[model samples]
Target: PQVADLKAFSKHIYNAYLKNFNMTKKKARSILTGKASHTAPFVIHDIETLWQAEKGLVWKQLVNGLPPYKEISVHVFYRCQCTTVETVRELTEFAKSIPSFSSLFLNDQVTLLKYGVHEAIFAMLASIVNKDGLLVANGSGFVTREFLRSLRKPFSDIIEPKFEFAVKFNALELDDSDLALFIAAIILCGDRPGLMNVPRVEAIQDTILRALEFHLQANHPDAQYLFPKLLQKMADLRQLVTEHAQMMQRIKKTETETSLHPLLQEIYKD
Candidate 1:
């Protein structure tokens, strides 16, 4: 399961990089530095299937200002309120999860935007999930901490974002660098790094290893020996993500509405 989680980290990064699929780098970077706008923290993610976007729509309502897109991601600071939210176990339970969800603590000088009550809480959850992937992603070399160095650090650079759609959170006053990193992390995972080359065979093997390993353990818990091998595969996958750039390589996906992702189907097959 740990191996599977690690692989998910890579995939998460890869997918995030794709967020700005059609945008220009100069434009993207400009958007990265901002305080707030009508569309700051939201990333309109157009999913292949709209049903998969149910959660994203819910994101729009709770967050104050979001982008105009099919499926958007609204990132908020780690500690805040969740006033009118319908998800995350009713608004009441959300309050309980947050302070504890203070996981990454990308607060004060670090976090990206100011959020409404609920928006910040979601960002809080996003941070933890981001961390799970970061640990293994960093370990695998799928993601590099250095890439994030320029985003915040001083944090004050956010007072004036270059893009019209620059985002904000917590309140109109805060800048969500944490959210910026969150979005950038996704893009980094998916984009082709500046100087990295991964062979196709190697990329395929590593991506599947970390990704499918999740299914591996779910079905093969009795076989403890399989775990160690899975971990090695997970590490290799992230290395491939970073060194070769997952996007430079073609993405091959099969539409298996009836068929499960191999990992899920492993239960019945083995």
Candidate 2:
């Protein structure tokens, strides 16, 4: 059975996932929580006081006084830009580490990345969100859920669902290793809108889905229906990405001043 073959191959790939994903996780955690020295503790994230923080600052950079809402939105956008860039880079490296991904044509690879990186990114974001808010700037800042809800139209709409999905995803109790495999599966999806090698991509995705289901069964043996639950989460991610795309289109039409980074523009250009 191809599933059996993939089951063995995925074991090796999953180990590769362990190594590279840990590195990526460390980098992400370093950017979100603090340095490796681990001296500083995580503080609650608050959007209202994002600028007016004490030494107990949860975000990395802060101004002495409150900036105007437009400026604050711009600041938040830039921070998100930095995070998105780094994450895409790391995710690309992780994809390259998988033989199935690496074997694809360069054009096909780029197509997959362009369509799926942001969706996987939001999935990964669930790791950093708590019941209250998201961790920002390596744990130097905490952006409150309420504060995010208060932002202007597209911006607020863009972030709120991610937090909503994240809180419930965190409740699933999947670890970084689990997240790594999940992200790999997300990025390698064959069903993306403009894939060049649909059959090849679908084959890869099937292998990953089987591997993931097996991993979940092994990892969460006592949990009933966790496998199907994960399938539902993947479906949820698809809807979230669709909503995000609509929001992006609205921003282009209505929020002209809020330009997207070139990389992000490229990712969503289709």
Candidate 3:
């Protein structure tokens, strides 16, 4: 496809990204830096601070039906799961908006989504993250990376790698426009297991990859090697997902009381 056609595709994808995601990098940066003209975000860095925030009522409400409330790590994991599930929904909507994606066989679409959503989620997660912390509760709360590190074994293990990834990802400084095509490329991957039509998926992904390269040239003209660097990041993300799935399986076996969302269960199922 020509640059003109791909530019239009990029715009449509950007619109889908904007419409679906609750927090954009631009908005999160403003909130994180206290430049958004909003009230100070509730900062959760330790148990005492968390308790002082409405005497834990806020967290109680946030975790709601998920029980074993005394276990702090469990509560944190549940909150993380909640936000992840919401992100997955946004990702699904974004994928559906792509014309070529909508043309895939239904089972192939499901296979793509089941494998691709976490990669998409982690990529988007970088938008709300900085080295110190990440915005939660739709920018109302900022959870420190230090606080996440304070959680128990498997739970603590699950979050910190993402922070590491997000910190590095933010360094690249790509805006929402570039991320639109990047995320579409992540979801439309043909390498996913059990894909019904690999050739069709591969062809679509090739177009997206081409568009991303062309878009980056016009968008970041002076930034040499950005395209190849992004491709490398995609490979890194696949490895990250592999490690994350291993940790999740461990949690399922040990923390049997912890509930995984049904949608997430479907995505995580082997």
Candidate 4:
């Protein structure tokens, strides 16, 4: 009976995660696809090229009071910012929905978010990145990986490796269930340098890890290395996020005119 109860408990928790996971996944894809009235096309090329082509849509804004920010407007800079913010917001909600994550102290929650959100963001961003670059506006456009690589300094380095990792991670062919547990494992980790309840967090992570292994066994009976590869991806995510934090610092210190969302600013403060 106790064994049955444990399985039942795990299943219930998994289901809750699935609900939030599916919900946010669709929400994110929709944001990129213009289905929710966000009709801006996902631009993939150099912003300067577009700026030169349209001349900033300055005349359109002057006459109509808004830039012609549609069909690949020359607003890649701000558009990417908005997209990241939206992604972070949805991801926060997704984290809150996880039973283990929401159980942590508020400060710990913030800490986990501070250290973990960008990693999660890039992991999620992997879904969109591809061989030719990522899908923009749900396949209505494409951002050449090379074009992103050509962007000015800091921002250029920030996104390129993410594309590289995403291409490989996506190749692993993880389904939603696999990704759900993987993401949960990422957020619930106990070793983020500062935490009030390391043991508790560790316990939660252990449970998630067990569940993930059990899941992979059933989901990929033939793939022996898939489990360890996923763990390595998580490790790689941590390293990538650290590099990103460094770039964020460079951006904040050197590019004083640039702005970051306050929420993002707070998360990156550490």
User: Which number leads on lDDT?
Assistant: 3
Q: Sort by lDDT, best first: what order?
A: 3, 2, 4, 1
Q: How do the residues 11-120 of candidate 2 rate in per-residue lDDT, one tens digit apiece?
A: 66666666554234435555444555445434434553565554455333343332333666655665676678777887788788888899999888998888888888
lDDT by residue (1-270, candidate 1, tens digit) is 657565555444334333422222333333333332344323322322222333444432333332222111112110011221222223223222223222323331121111122232233222212211111111111111222223232221211121111221111211122232233222112122221322432343354344444544454455565545434423433443232222211111221111122321221121
lDDT of 2 at 12: 68
State TM-scores per candidate. 0.18, 0.82, 0.94, 0.77
Off by more than 4 A, model 3: 52-62, 67-70
How many angstroms is residue 153 displaced in model 2 relative to the true structure, after the best TM-score fit? Answer: 2.6
- Candidates sorted by TM-score, best first: 3, 2, 4, 1
What is the lDDT for 244 in model 2?
A: 85
Worst 10-residue stretch by lDDT in candidate 2? 59-68
Which is the leading candidate under TM-score?
Answer: 3
Q: Report the lDDT of model 4 for residue 146.
A: 77
Candidate 2 wrong stretches, greater than 4 Å: 1-8, 15-48, 52-70
Q: What is each predicted model's overall lDDT from 0 to 1?
A: 0.27, 0.73, 0.87, 0.68
TM-score of 3: 0.94
Error of 1 at 190 (Å): 20
lDDT of 3 at 79: 77
Q: What tens digits encode model 3's per-residue C-alpha lDDT throughout 170-218?
A: 9999998899999999999999999999999999999999899999999
Q: Candidate 4: misplaced stretches above 4 Å?
A: 1-18, 21-43, 46-75, 137-141
